[PDB]
Amino acid sequence: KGANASAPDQLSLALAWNRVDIARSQIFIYGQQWPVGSLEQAMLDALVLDRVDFVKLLIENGVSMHRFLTISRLEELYNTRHGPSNTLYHLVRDVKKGNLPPDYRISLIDIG
């Protein structure tokens, strides 16, 4: 309340705090008037950070995964450093027979 922040900023703060009940009770309320392309960005940020409860909450609050997920957004989701450590980079190195330059964007063809 005292941050003088709009609904996207309140949602971003709740995402950073990993408190979903605060967004459930205070943020997602009648007549909040999210701007265009705000819930989609919230879905992308909650998808990167591995916040399953926030993804479920956004799904229940309007955003459809058929219209959100595109080629560019999926390619972005494959190249994030936020979240638990994975083993995708070593797999891409093995498939690409080595010689992998540092700071290389992983394309969907390499995922295939």
């Binding site: 009648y30 007549g31 008037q33 479920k56 799904i59 229940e60 609050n61 309007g62 955003v63 459809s64 058929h66 219209r67």
Partner: protein
């Protein structure tokens, strides 16, 4: 316009999938004229949607403007309505568009859908001119996806999800109501005369449920109480609107300067005339109060008020 509408065949009917909330809920729908014969509507709802004749008809009326109900009151209303419409084959006639009491019915069905089997046959009779996306429904005979995202500045409304069937009526105009009241009333009248499976000779029993309301809910209650078969109504006390006015009038049977409630035309308004035409037949109206009086359960209140 001076009622200059082209008579054209229906170009919008099929199934809509509600992309949105975490459910996969289909919904049949059809676009029909503002004045169609109820025999055709009954035939469509029986032979084409594969639905049996109901043993109970619940007509839900309420306010169009969005309101809110305090907790421990909506959870004793929605669950009661769900139990009453699930223990018996019932058709929950509703407005259809996601606003007002329709939102409450929708979330009541959402609460039931995650904790029990079966489906509640909810039929939403909504005017065609208020849907915020007329497109994506103009598709014919095939499944058409539909988004439940609400745009604040669209000056329209969206079809409420969690409804099993829809009947969309249009009179040519777009953006205003008034194209479904006559159709809904005539459909209820024509279905109330339909013979139930018992061979005594009685039609199916219909009932009315009132939550919140306005200056028009009193008129439709008066119309319900004056039909050739009387139709009992059930009102709620915690709404605060004209339903609570009916609750206040139920007490002190038979303080006239109390009409200055400022809800609609604060002073010198002619609603007391129809409120006096009502309460003369105060043998059908049943008032539900949470813990103040008997019948603490809505399902008990609705069924008892019908016998």
């Amino acid at each position: 316009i001076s009622k200059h509408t082209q008579l054209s065949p229906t170009d919008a009917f099929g199934t809509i999938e509600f992309q949105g909330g975490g459910h996969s809920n289909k919904a049949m729908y059809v676009r029909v004229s503002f004045d169609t014969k109820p025999d055709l509507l009954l035939h469509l709802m029986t032979k084409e949607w594969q639905l049996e004749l109901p043993k109970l008809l619940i007509s839900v009326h309420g306010g169009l403007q969005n309101f809110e109900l305090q907790p421990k009151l909506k959870q004793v209303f929605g669950k009661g309505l769900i139990k009453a419409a699930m223990t018996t084959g019932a058709w929950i006639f509703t407005g259809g568009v996601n606003t007002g009491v329709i939102r409450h019915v929708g979330d009541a069905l959402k609460d039931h859908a995650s904790k029990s089997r079966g489906k509640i046959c909810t039929i939403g009779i909504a005017p065609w001119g208020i849907v915020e996306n007329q497109e994506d429904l103009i598709g014919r005979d095939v499944v058409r996806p539909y988004q439940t995202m609400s745009n604040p500045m669209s000056k329209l409304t969206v079809l409420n999800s969690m409804h099993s069937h829809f009947i969309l009526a249009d009179n040519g105009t777009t953006g205003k109501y008034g194209a479904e009241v006559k159709l809904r009333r005539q459909l209820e009248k024509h279905i109330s005369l339909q013979k139930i499976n018992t061979r005594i000779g009685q039609g199916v029993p219909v009932v009315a449920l009132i939550v919140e309301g306005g200056p028009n809910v009193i008129s439709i209650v008066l119309e319900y109480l004056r039909d050739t078969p009387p139709v009992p109504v059930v009102v709620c006390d915690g709404s605060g609107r004209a339903s609570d006015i009916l609750a206040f009038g139920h007490k002190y049977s038979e303080v006239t300067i109390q009409k200055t409630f400022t809800y609609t035309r604060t002073q010198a308004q002619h609603l007391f005339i129809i409120l006096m035409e009502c309460m003369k037949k105060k043998e059908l109206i049943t008032v539900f109060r949470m813990g103040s009086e008997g019948h603490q359960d809505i399902d008990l209140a609705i069924l008892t008020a019908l016998l």
